[PDB]
């Protein structure tokens, strides 16, 4: 019962090798190959298919299928047809063909072309070619790392869009900004603990907690500069980039770093609004020793340490923690930029309106004192008010601009990341389209924009530490040195 043979005139095998494997027969036909009418032409069409040498999971199941349709066995004026299971085994791994161009009519599993349950002479042939992937991709087995319809390989950990030198330059930029920001916030923490007995008043001690946030946030940024520490945070066990964390196949070094960075930076950002409110209500009672914040201290912490906690947990719940090779940390919204609109631009924008409101309102009250009471208090007192008004002015200008910078950088990624993703996809297609049978990336993110965006981040931490850059703090450390 030969449901698997069809009448055809056997021709002599002009090629005794199919995709790098020996053939146990010596007769073929172009009957099954509807796109070619000659062995030289069918062999040429196999060169085009050879581009699928990448993405091993499809190359392993399509090799037998091709050497059974283009170079099938012919004996006694009879050609052997491929089995239907041999054809079904290619629709899954090789779903990319249907996307890029579409399968040919003679390669679709049809009963007239691929009957169910037939012997295959190619099943006895050993194909040594396992499948090599281009430079940007890397071999991996876990399905959660495969590039879109490229089953068998994922994106290498080191960002393919930037070179080794561009990675080294960015790391030096972060090592420099991270160290100064870490040392500046530490200087604020030290001056507070050195005089904690008096500094622990809350209209001012809030600065201690803001610098504490940006300090811890800087620790997560500087963690990458350890031996083999960045590879543990950004990479996976197979050698591909991290994304969609948390998972169950990788470690926790990525989600750990993210919580240190996102929670600390968001906590310090909301501390800014609490500070502006504290300044706003303290100025209303200026001129007296009355404390309007006598019973609002605990309420401040219960609101500043819980908001960033709900936000962080929400990100972990939707699993949008990604890893970047250039920055050296794990953050939210790297892969899918939409999430960075609600978990970054939304909290930052809100603290700019409410925080900026109290900031402007607080200066108005400080400006009314100079006008409502002229000549009552002068000398040092008058200088302290103007110097504080100027200190709050340069501070709001600085925060307003850094938020403008962040919104500019985010809108830049919102507008071109889709195009960036196309560029890399087309770059992966040409590599197999030109070589087997030079490429260049069309568009990539701007490193300058990334630095400008980090400048607004690190700049905020250094701006928070400038509030203790006074002559009064210098005396605090001059006293501790004497007692030593």
């Amino acid at each position: 019962l030969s449901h698997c043979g069809r009448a055809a005139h056997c021709e002599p095998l002009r090629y005794n090798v199919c995709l790098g494997s020996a053939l146990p027969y010596g007769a073929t036909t172009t009957l099954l190959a509807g796109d070619s009418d000659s062995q030289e032409e069918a062999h040429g069409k196999l060169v085009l298919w050879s581009g699928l040498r990448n993405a091993p999971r499809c190359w392993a199941v399509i090799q037998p299928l091709l050497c059974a349709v283009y170079m099938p066995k012919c004996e006694n004026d009879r050609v052997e047809l491929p089995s239907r299971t041999l054809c079904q085994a290619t629709r899954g791994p090789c779903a990319i063909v249907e996307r890029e161009r579409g399968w040919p009519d003679f390669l679709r599993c049809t009963p007239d072309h691929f009957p169910e349950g037939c012997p295959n002479e190619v099943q006895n042939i050993k194909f040594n070619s396992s499948g090599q992937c281009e430079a940007p991709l890397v071999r991996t087995d876990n399905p959660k790392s495969w590039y879109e319809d490229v089953e068998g390989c994922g994106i290498q950990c080191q960002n393919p869009l930037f070179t080794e030198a561009e990675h080294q330059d960015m790391h030096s930029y972060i090592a420099a900004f991270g160290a100064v920001t870490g040392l500046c916030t530490l200087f604020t923490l030290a001056t507070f603990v050195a005089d904690w007995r008096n500094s622990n008043r809350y209209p001012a001690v809030i600065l201690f907690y803001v610098n504490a946030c940006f300090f811890v946030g800087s620790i997560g940024w500087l963690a990458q500069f350890m031996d083999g520490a960045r590879r543990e945070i950004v990479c996976r066990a197979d050698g591909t980039m991290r994304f969609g964390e948390p998972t169950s196949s990788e470690t926790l070094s990525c989600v750990i770093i993210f919580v240190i960075v996102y929670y600390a930076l968001m906590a310090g950002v909301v501390w800014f609004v609490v500070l502006t409110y504290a300044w706003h209500t303290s100025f209303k009672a200026l001129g007296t020793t009355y404390q309007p914040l006598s019973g609002k201290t605990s309420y401040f912490h219960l609101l500043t340490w819980s908001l960033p906690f709900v936000l962080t947990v929400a990100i972990l719940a939707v699993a949008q923690v990604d890893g970047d090779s250039v920055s050296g940390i794990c953050f939210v919204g790297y892969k899918n930029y939409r999430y960075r609109a609600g978990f970054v631009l939304a909290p930052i924008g809100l603290v700019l309106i409410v925080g900026g409101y109290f900031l402007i309102r607080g200066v108005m009250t400080l400006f009314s004192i100079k006008s409502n009471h002229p000549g009552l208090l002068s000398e040092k007192a008058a200088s302290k008010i103007n110097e504080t008004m100027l200190r709050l002015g340069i501070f709001g200008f600085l925060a307003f601009g850094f938020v403008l910078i962040t919104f500019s950088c985010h809108f830049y990624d919102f507008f071109n990341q889709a195009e960036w993703e196309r560029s890399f996809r087309d770059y992966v297609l040409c590599q197999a389209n030109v070589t087997i049978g030079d490429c260049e990336i069309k568009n990539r993110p701007s490193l300058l924009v990334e630095k400008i965006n980090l400048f607004a981040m690190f700049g905020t931490g250094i701006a928070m530490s400038t509030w203790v850059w006074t002559k009064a703090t210098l005396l605090i450390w001059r006293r501790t040195w004497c007692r030593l």
Epitope: T191, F192, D195, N198, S199, R201, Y202, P203, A204, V205, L207, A278, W279, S282, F283, L286, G287, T288, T289, Q291, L293, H373, L376, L377, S378, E379, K380, A381, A382, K384, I385, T388, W467, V468, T470, K471, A472, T473
Partner: nanobody, 122 residues
Framework: QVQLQESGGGLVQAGGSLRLSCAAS????????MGWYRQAPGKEREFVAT???????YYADSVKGRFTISRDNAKNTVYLQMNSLKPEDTAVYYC????????????????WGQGTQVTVSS
Amino acid sequence: QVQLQESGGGLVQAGGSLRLSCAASGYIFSSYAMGWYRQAPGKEREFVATIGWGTITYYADSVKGRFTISRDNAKNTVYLQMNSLKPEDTAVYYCAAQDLLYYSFPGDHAYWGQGTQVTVSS
């Protein structure tokens, strides 16, 4: 830097009146906000009253009504007129002279006095 010196404290009976004063050794009396505080031998420092630039004044809940605060800009002295004293008012009343922006910024300092005990007998 200014040094304060309170006076007028002493033992008194319930329902009586007392007048405490706070003299500040130093010409800088206006550029500093001042107020009265009290601390019992087993309690934290409690807020009493304060005086602003004009008629602005703040009092505690258990103090408002009975206490009265007034300043003498010329004599660099702040007064606290206590009336109808209750035994629960027994405490060492202190006098603080702090910078205007003392609460909001760590660079500023607050200067306190020695305090005077005021005991009320039932």
